[PDB]
Design a protein around this ligand. Sequence first.
Ligand code: HEC
Ligand code: HEC
Lengths: 83, 83
Amino acid sequence: NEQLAKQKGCMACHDLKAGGGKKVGPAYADVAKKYAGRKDAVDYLAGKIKKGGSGVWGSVPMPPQNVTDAEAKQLAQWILSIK
Amino acid sequence: NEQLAKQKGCMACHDLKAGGGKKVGPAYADVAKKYAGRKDAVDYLAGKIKKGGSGVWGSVPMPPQNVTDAEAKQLAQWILSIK
Ligand code: HEC
Ligand code: HEC
């Protein structure tokens, strides 16, 4: 399974899918660093995940995503936790 | 959480951290595409995982991995499942 592969060190040499390093959106660790000082980061990011947005990291927009309000908040919190 | 983000499609457009794209081995989805539906795929891949391999995807070899035969079979089956 995926967790076993992580534990065994496999992911030092392998990604799940191709295209690493060339994606259209920002790295989550950079999102986490940016908003570390921001008290309302969770709701700000949840809004962007659900409703989409542009201009914060580049000119290409993130389209609105198929997530509930609760999921958007959960994803925001997880991203903020990334170190 | 991490699994939720993967399941929702977020990772098509985002990496977890900066510096992606330099892994030395093939992406698992590409391994899965190659060997999908071959009658000996599980045994073949389990053997490469455990014993290592060279020259199938490039010049850089995979060393033997610290896995049991059962774990190698588990890992092979998981990799073959990656869409
Ligand atoms: C942790 C136990 C794993 C698992 C499950 C896999 N790998 Fe590797 N791998 C690496 C390289 C350079 C290759 C290509 C070798 C070649 O050109 O022949 C591979 C290949 C694979 C495969 C496909 C094998 C095939 O013949 O098609 C598979 C299923 C696979 N790996 C699984 C490099 C590395 C590492 C670099 C030091 C390490 C660590 C791992 N791999 C670990 C694992
Ligand atoms: C799956 C539900 C997700 C989640 C959890 C996130 N994204 Fe994206 N995203 C994309 C692009 C181009 C941007 C930059 C937009 C801009 O310049 O403003 C983003 C941005 C984000 C953020 C940061 C938002 C901010 O204002 O700081 C976050 C937290 C985030 N995303 C999470 C592109 C895409 C996609 C391309 C089609 C898709 C799919 C996703 N993102 C999916 C998700």
